[PDB]
């Protein structure tokens, strides 16, 4: 078991030292619905996210990931996974303090990332006037910015990719669909519990840091929307890191930008390659053939930011780029 | 283990009968750019560049069109035995075989309406010769330079005299869940089912002519809306009959394009994957036949009653005669 | 000479018995900028329209086109064209009472359509905060709805297509790139004075009416935007007539919807086929073999409205569809 | 005056040391039709090119442009333009030795680029079975590779951009829609004689060479096709330089690759922004503030090739990239 115990990535919490600007980024540009406000946080969801929220913005001294929560495939699976972690000496705590959700098990990845598991999730129902004629779509697509449909995946930065990968595979039942190696060292791993290539990935922190967030990605499902989104970001002064293009690794149409708070956000295009074959061997990418893996087109990922910057960062984004530029 | 939700992995292949085998072959190679991996007797085997096994499509010469069979691959060898046993204990006649190139032990059976279905686990993983391998590691073969190449098989739609009976079989015997359905009063006239995050890999719609065990259509995946636009322009200028599309069905949020291959079978070109069912606990969405506009098409597309809701293969009348008959 | 006297379609005015709803349609869904408000009318422009406005919405008892103005290639061209019309005995009037524009020659088509020619047009300059980093783009693309870039073309419904075609060809110097005939009668003509396949089209009125507007089109330039637009119209209750698909005639990616006031509006995708060849013969389509001409894809153009409904209409859109169904 | 004398870019000839590989590139990947073969040359056309050919591939010791020919808007216009060049002391030669075309005037730009003017051009008619149901389309879109529709534009490298610019403006009547400057020095100019932002561009040669070709571009009109094309080139081992993305300058969706012979070829997506305004002022970009001009997206144009490599090149592409690091 453990194999089919995890259903999908339900939500993530981002910390931001410029909470209002981050909120404006997610509403004005990415068209997310705000469903709740309390204390230091604001809760949002894309029009096709199934629960009250998929994103939580929380004011903080620095940027980074407050947590990421995965929803299990049943309440039985939740008990199973939490039991596995506890039996494995992984410290965890049960709680039930989040709007729109129930009992949740909180724990740390081997590198310090805040992870959570839950089953109890309220099915979001929009106000009558905002319900879509498309029955599988809870809310009508907003008429603001270039609206994302839902959260897509999470990419964690780590001092030890294998340690994190092992935890997801062993305790959560994830399978690694693709990975990148240097010698016999894993510097990148993409993992999934369903037909998606991945919903959680882990890449080596080239600065020697640990427990950082590389990026949180949101789904468009249409390549043209990354083109529309980047033109928007360019004209409305949002820093563009790379893209739009497509990574050979995971066959993902990507667009990386930096929201006002300092976190890296990815806009994801076409779903791409779905893993229908139930027992496909993990594909291992090498340095010798990493060109296509990084980008099918002419896109070039900046060493001074993409492979080195993650949040929280001891240096500001500008300070960082200047330091690793050489 | 008694939990059967994950026993079926996906739709592996389908076989189409055609009274014009060569023209049908040309359709799938010249226009849809599929690779031919085997030839035997009166059949030709093909695969899209991203299909994982030796073939996902088999074209067989026959006096009439229709579906020879459809085979689903399980998630493990154990799942195959469990599903086969469920069917057997349910008094469903079944037969084991190992007849096909590129595959192993297979369980053959028929749906309540007579559709030829199959279950299997043993499948050879297709490996392209060095020269045809893609630099994209999850892609077995390079995308062909012929026509508008489809990536893989996507789903199948079966026409039936009793949708509810077919749905019940997939649900209780194969572990499928029904994501969406359409009812007319208190009668189910359409059901879309799945065992994974796809909205569906197998659908069933009521035969409005009174027939049964027919094939409504076999669908192939592009994943890009623009390719349905490119495809239809190609079909129009190269004399392939177009039924409807490109547009998008509200039901299953699928970008569709329906055309008729030379043999008479309806084939669908599928665009963006659309809406993935991430929520593992979502209730079936039920559409009313009386409030179906959005469900049929988000755009201005119109599905002809003279063919879309009445034509399936094999058909008592040839396509032309069928349309003329049901038009008035 | 003559051929190059008309530069492009500058603007159009739409009459609407539901002016507020019509304005909401163009701003909330089509993301057009409002540049001026005055009495019974509102002025708008797409973010890439060169002048203060390309669309004027005016409150009226019925729907329809108030007018359409074409800009000339020079001031000399304007005098030449106006003189040609006058010499042809076409009644015309000079004026200068519109915001953002100058001297204008007003006249009517052989079928009663209100047309105008002008040269003096102010070049819109957006406030600094709204200027685009793309220098050829006056304003940033709005963050509302699915923003149209600019006006594209006009399609006039007439009781005599050839009569209208002759006016544009002989007096304005337009060429007819494509046409549709039924026996010896022209029932459709698409005319241009530049690289575009057409900026003004004229189709036969099959109801015995005359001087009506079939539709006004706005440019996206991207096929996916018609897909996004129709999904928006569907979920936000705007009546969809046909599309998205592509007409073989003019090779245009189309999407036809009805705005609240009753006028037909087309959302236009890829520019399509540009007429680079300077002396290509007019392509003539036959009504007897028009399938590809109407739609490359599977789109079906409803006779109950597409070939029969135009504004102003004696019957409401609902009554019309019911009647011709 | 001469403002409308030139209609469009009719064709171009590319030299290649690997003629067969270059031919395969344009046929197997870009789906162009071969319409003629003579001596050491092959003639091709996109399915929507109006004449027998838009591209001529000629075997040669080095890469580069054999010539580029523009078609005038009339025979009178040809006489006028040639007259202007001759009166300006520009050496010219009249000839008529090209398949599918008639009398043409051959001359050189101030930097040595081989240019030509002509009016007589045969209208290509495809064999019965290859004619398209779309009447404005001469031949059916091929079922090979990702077929380009037609030639789009040319970009010339020059030791003196202003000199080349003056020639096109003064002698051909072209207008400069956009340009890039550094102080009082023009390092780039985009010119047109019609609604297109440009059909001919000129950029500074940073190596000190002259009369070279930066790139020849072909039209798709669809952004997705550049995405499709780049994936094809990547998996079929064609060197990719930059893109798919969009230049703020000229608002063009670009994809630059190197064909087997060494020439840079651009695949062009959406037509983009059409210059409908007849008297729009030239948009001048500053070299110091050109981020958006180079690319709206995150694309990065490599200095080691994009701004320095042109054909013919004294160094092989490999050696050139190595040299400029
Ligand atoms: O994350 C992806 O989907 C992707 O294609 C990027 C992979 C990047 C790397 O190979 C990488 C390697 C070491 C450290 C950081 C990043
Ligand atoms: O199959 C689909 O995705 C779809 O939108 C079509 C639904 C068609 C029907 O409702 C239907 C009803 C009765 C008989 C045949 C077809
Ligand atoms: O306007 C177009 O581009 C187009 O393809 C529409 C042509 C419609 C007609 O053939 C038509 C014929 C008679 C009366 C009205 C319209
Ligand atoms: O050609 C274009 O559309 C474009 O955006 C490229 C502009 C490149 C330059 O500014 C340039 C400047 C100096 C030397 C070569 C090239
Ligand atoms: Fe990612
Ligand atoms: Fe289907
Ligand atoms: Fe139109
Ligand atoms: Fe270019």
| Other Cβ atoms within 10 Å of C182 Cβ, number | 13
The reported resolution of this PDB entry, expressed in Å, is 1.8
What residues of A form the annotated binding site for Ca(2+)? 91-92
Residue identified by tokens 């391998």 is: B133
- Alpha-carbon gap, residue A324 to A301, rounded angstroms: 13
* Cross-sheet strand order for the sheet of D150-158: D239-247, D252-258, D264-268, D212-219, D150-158, D200-204, D185-192, D175-182, D283-286
The bridge status of strand A175-182 relative to strand A92-95 is: unpaired
Q: How far apart are CA B57 and CA B154, in angstroms?
A: 11
CA angle A108, A113, A117 (to 5 degrees): 55
Task: List CB contacts of C29: < 8 A, sequence separation 6 or more.
Answer: A143, C145, C146, C229, C232, C233, C236, C238
- Judge whether D72 is closer than 8 Å to chain C, CB to CB: yes
Determine which residue's CA is closest to atom 15 belonging to ligand 4.
D307
Q: How far apart are CA B39 and CA A164, in angstroms?
A: 47
A42 and A27 Cβ atoms separated by less than 8 Å: no
Phi then psi for D82, rounded to 5 degrees? -65, -40
User: Nearest Cα to A36, choosing from A9, A54, A48?
Assistant: A54
| Structure-determination approach | X-ray
CA distance D234 to B249: 34
Dihedral sign for Cα atoms in the order A286, A288, A292, A298:
positive
Angle at B96 between CA B90 and CA B97, to 5 degrees: 155
Q: What is the number of alpha carbons within 13 Å of residue A325 lying toward its C-beta? A: 7
Is A140 in CB contact (< 8 Å) with chain C?
A: yes
Say if residues D214 and D198 touch (Cβ distance below 8 Å): no
User: What residues of A are in contact with residue C133 (Cβ under 8 Å)?
Assistant: 234-235
- Within this chain, do residues C133 and C156 fall inside the same structural domain, yes or no? no
User: Rounded to whole angstroms, how far apart are CA atoms D274 and C50?
Assistant: 11
Q: Does C249 contact ligand 3 (Cβ within 6 A)?
A: yes
- CA A151 to mean position of chain CA atoms: 7
C159 lies in the same domain as C180: yes
Torsion of CA A131, A136, A140, A142, to 10 degrees: 150
The size of chain A, in residues, is 326
How far is Cα C94 from Cα D184, in angstroms, rounded to an integer? 44
B38 carries a ligand binding annotation: no
Helix (H) or strand (E) holding B319: helix B319-327
Rg of chain C, C-alpha, whole Å: 19
Q: Partners of D45 in the beta sheet?
A: D33
Give the count of beta carbons closer than 10 Å to the beta carbon of residue D38: 11
What are the φ/ψ torsions at residue C321 (nearest 5 degrees)? -55, -45
Q: Phi first, then psi: give them for residue B191, nearest 5 degrees.
A: -145, 135
- Mapped onto helix, strand or coil, the DSSP state of residue A138 is coil
Residues D325 and D177 in one domain: yes
Q: Which residues contact D83 (CB under 8 A, 6 or more apart)?
A: none
Kindly state whether residues C183 and C271 are assigned to the same domain: yes
Q: Does C135 touch chain A (CB under 8 A)?
A: no
For residue B109, give both structure tokens.
Answer: 């059976």
Task: Give whole-number Cα distances, B106 to B44, B103, C206, in Å.
Answer: 19, 8, 62
Q: How far is CA C223 from CA B205, C254, C263, in A?
A: 31, 9, 23
DSSP summary character for residue D249: G
In this structure, the answer to whether residues A108 and A180 fall within a common structural domain is no
* Known binding-site residue numbers of D for Fe(3+): 153, 215, 266
Phi and psi torsions of A108, nearest 5°: -110, 145
Residue C237 near residue A131 (C-beta atoms within 8 A)? no
Q: Which residue has the tokens 């409908």?
A: D276
Alpha helices in chain D (DSSP H): 19-24, 75-87, 161-172, 223-235, 291-294, 317-323
Rounded alpha-carbon distances, angstroms, from residue D221 to B247, C270, C273: 21, 7, 9
Which residues are within 8 A (CB) of B80 and not within 5 positions of it... i.e. 6 or more apart?
Answer: B74, B105, B107, B119, B120, B121
CB-based pocket (< 6 A), ligand 4: D 155, 180, 187-188, 201, 203-204, 206, 247, 249-250, 252, 293-294, 307
Give the full edge-to-edge strand order of the sheet including A283-285. Answer: A239-247, A252-258, A264-268, A212-219, A150-158, A200-204, A185-192, A175-182, A283-285
Q: Rounded to whole angstroms, how far apart are CA atoms D145 and B146?
A: 6
Residue that is written with structure tokens 């780049």 in the block: D230
Q: CA-CA distance, A134 to A150, in Å (whole number)?
A: 16
CB atoms inside a 10 Å sphere around CB A50: 22
Beta bridge partner(s), residue A72: A6
- Lookup result for tokens 């949020």: B253
Packing angle of the helix pair B225-237, C223-235 (nearest 10 deg): 110
Tell me which chain B residues have a C-beta less than 8 angstroms from the C-beta of A291.
Answer: 135
- Is B131 in the same domain as B232? no
**Beta bridge pairs of residue C218:** C151, C267
**What SS3 string covers chain C?**
CCCCCEEEEEEEEEEECCHHHHHHHHHHHCCCEEEEEECCEEEEECCCCCCCCCEEEEECCCCEEEEEEEEECCHHHHHHHHHHHHHCCCCEEEECCCCCECCEEEEECCCCCEEEEECCECCCCCCHHHCCCCCCCCCCCCCECCCCCEEEEEEEEECCHHHHHHHHHHHHCCEEEEEEEECCEEEEEEEECCCCCCCEEEEECCCCCCCEEEEEEEECCCHHHHHHHHHHHHHCCCCEEEEEEEECHHHEEEEEEECCCCCEEEEECCCCCCCCCCCCCCEEEEHHHCHHHHCCCCCCCCCCCCCCCCECCCCCHHHHHHHHC
Is the four-CA dihedral C13, C17, C22, C23 of positive or negative sign?
A: positive
Ramachandran class of C220: left when φ > 0, alpha when ψ lies in -120 to 50, beta otherwise: alpha
Spatial distance between the Cα atoms of B324 and B306, rounded to a whole number of angstroms = 8
Distance of alpha carbon B320 from alpha carbon C126, whole angstroms: 59
Q: Where are the beta strands (DSSP E) in D73-142?
A: 92-95, 104-108, 114-118
Rounded Cα distance, D238 and D219, in Å: 19
The residues that bridge with A6 in the sheet, in sequence order, are: A72
Are D244 and A243 in contact (CB < 8 Å)? no
Q: How far is the CA of B325 from the centre of ligand 2 (A)?
A: 20
Are residues D310 and D214 in contact, defined by beta-carbon separation less than 8 angstroms?
A: yes
Chain D hits for C69, CB-CB cut-off 8 Å, are none
CA distances from D22 to A270, C266, D40, D63, D67 (A): 33, 43, 13, 10, 17
User: Do you find a cis peptide bond into C312, omega within 30 degrees of 0?
Assistant: yes
Instruction: Answer whether B246 touches C (CB < 8 Å).
Output: yes
Name D153's bridge partners.
D217
Distance between CA atoms of D49 and D31, rounded to whole angstroms?
13
Domain presence at residue B1? no
Count of CB atoms within 10 A of residue D7's CB? 23
Q: Which residues of A touch D224 (CB under 8 A)?
A: 223-224
Report the distance separating Cα C6 and Cα C194, nearest Å: 8
Q: List C-alpha distances in Å: C239 to B287, B294, C15, C62, C286.
A: 21, 12, 18, 18, 30
CB B58 within 8 A of CB B17: no
Q: Cα dist. B173→A1, A2, B156, B192, D138 in Å? A: 21, 23, 18, 16, 56
CA dist., res. C108 & res. D72, Å (int): 34
D249 inside 8 A of chain A by CB: no
The residue out of B93, B108, B142 marking a domain boundary is B142
User: How many whole angstroms separate alpha carbon A147 and alpha carbon A129?
Assistant: 18
Length of chain D: 325
What is the helix (H) or strand (E) element at residue B159, kind and residue range? Answer: strand B152-160
Cβ A201 under 6 angstroms from ligand 1 = yes
Under 8 Å between Cβ of C178 and D135: yes
Instruction: Tell me, yes or no, whether A136 and A153 share the same domain.
Output: no
Mutual orientation of helices D75-87 and D161-172 as an angle, nearest 10°?
A: 130
Determine the Cα–Cα distance for residues C115 and C103; give it in Å rounded to an integer: 14
By DSSP bridging, strand C200-204 and strand C150-158 are parallel
Residue C286 phi, psi (nearest 5): -100, 135
Q: The CATH number of the domain where C211 resides is what?
A: 3.10.180.10
Nearest alpha carbon to residue A117 among A2, A275, A40, A250: A2
Question: Nearest to residue B268, comparing CAs of B210, B201, B208?
Answer: B201
- Rounded Cα gap, residues A88 and C176, in angstroms: 79
Structure tokens belonging to residue A14: 């981002």
Last-in-domain residue among D97, D116, D140: D140
Q: Which of C176, C303, C307 to mutate to test the pocket of ligand 3 (most atoms within 8 A of CB)?
A: C307
> Domain containing D104: what range?
5-140
A33-38 β-sheet, strand order? A33-38, A41-45, A55-59, A6-16, A64-72, A114-118, A104-108, A92-95
Q: Return the ∠ at Cα A228 (arms to A223 and A232), rounded to 5°.
A: 145
For a mutational test of ligand 2's pocket, the pick from B198, B205, B255, B307, i.e. the residue with the most ligand atoms closer than 8 A to its C-beta, is B205
- Report yes or no: C137 and C48 within 8 Å, Cβ to Cβ: yes
Residue B196 CB neighbours (<10 A): 23
- Kindly state the DSSP code that residue B313 receives in the 8-state scheme: B
Contact predicate C295/C301, CB 8 Å: yes
Residues D162 and D230 reside in one and the same domain? yes
In chain C, the number of structural domains is 2
- Eight-class DSSP state of D281: P
Residue with tokens 């089109």: C217
Gap between the Cα atoms of D275 and D175, Å rounded: 11
A231–D299 CB contact, under 8 Å: no
Q: Examine the domain organization and report whether B21 and B53 are in the same domain.
A: yes
Which of C111, C140, C169 is the endpoint of a domain? C140
B205 and B243 part of one domain: yes
Whether C298 contacts B242, CB under 8 Å: yes
Per-residue tokens: D210: 């002259």
DSSP assignment letter at B251: G
Is the separation of the CB atoms in D16 and D260 below 8 Å? yes
In terms of domains, do C62 and C181 share one? no
| Contact status, residue A302 vs residue A314, Cβ threshold 8 Å | no
Same-domain status, C72 and C191: no
Within a domain: residue B121? Answer: yes
The residue whose C-alpha atom lies closest to atom 9 belonging to ligand 2 is: B190
Bridge partners of residue C242, in order along the sequence: C256
Task: Supply C14's token pair.
Answer: 């739409």
With b meaning 16 or more CB within 10 Å and e meaning fewer, what string describes D238-273?
bbbbbbbbbbbbbbbbbbbbbbbbbbbbbbbbbbbb
CA dihedral B178, B179, B182, B186 (to 10 degrees): 50
Assess whether the C-beta atom of A253 lies below 6 angstroms from ligand 1: no
Angle at which helices A223-235 and D223-235 pack, to 10 degrees? 110
Contact predicate C62/C17, CB 8 Å: yes
Q: In whole angstroms, what is the distance from residue C7 CA to residue A9 CA? A: 55
In chain A, residues with a C-beta closer than 8 Å to the C-beta of D241 are 298
Residues in the ligand 2 pocket, defined by CB under 6 Å: B 157, 182, 189-190, 203, 205-206, 208, 249, 251-252, 254, 295-296, 309
């Amino acid at each position: 078991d453990a194999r089919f115990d995890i259903a999908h990535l339900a939500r993530a919490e981002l910390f931001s030292p410029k909470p209002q600007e981050t909120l404006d980024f997610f509403t004005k540009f990415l068209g997310m619905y705000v469903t709740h406000r309390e204390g230091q946080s604001v809760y949002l969801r894309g029009y096709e996210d199934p629960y009250p929220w998929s994103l939580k913005i929380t004011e903080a001294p620095e940027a980074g990931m407050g947590h990421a929560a995965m929803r299990t495939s049943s309440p039985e699976a939740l008990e199973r996974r939490a039991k596995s972690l506890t039996d494995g000496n992984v410290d965890g705590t049960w709680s039930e303090d989040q709007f729109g959700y129930g009992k949740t098990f909180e724990y740390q990845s081997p590198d310090g990332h805040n992870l959570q598991l839950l089953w109890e999730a309220e099915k979001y129902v929009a106000p009558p006037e905002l319900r879509s004629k498309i029955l599988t779509r809870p809310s009508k697509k907003p008429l603001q910015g270039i609206p994302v449909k839902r959260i897509d995946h999470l990419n964690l930065m780590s001092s030890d990719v294998t340690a994190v990968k092992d935890s997801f595979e062993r305790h959560l039942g994830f399978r690694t669909t693709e990975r990148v190696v240097d010698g016999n060292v894993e510097i990148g791993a993409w993992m999934s519990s369903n037909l998606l290539g991945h919903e959680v990935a882990c890449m080596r922190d080239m600065t020697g840091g640990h427990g950082k967030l590389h990026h949180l990605a949101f789904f468009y499902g249409t390549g043209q929307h990354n083109i529309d989104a980047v033109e928007m970001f360019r004209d409305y002064d949002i820093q563009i890191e790379a893209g739009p293009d497509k990574h050979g690794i995971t066959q993902s149409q990507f667009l990386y930008v930096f929201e006002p708070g300092g976190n890296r956000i990815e806009l994801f295009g076409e779903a791409g390659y779905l893993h229908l074959d139930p027992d496909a061997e993990t594909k291992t990418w090498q340095m010798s053939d990493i060109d296509t893996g990084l980008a099918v087109g002419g896109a070039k990922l900046p060493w001074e930011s993409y492979f080195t910057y993650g949040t929280p960062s001891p240096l500001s984004l500008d300070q960082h780029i200047e330091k690793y530029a050489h």
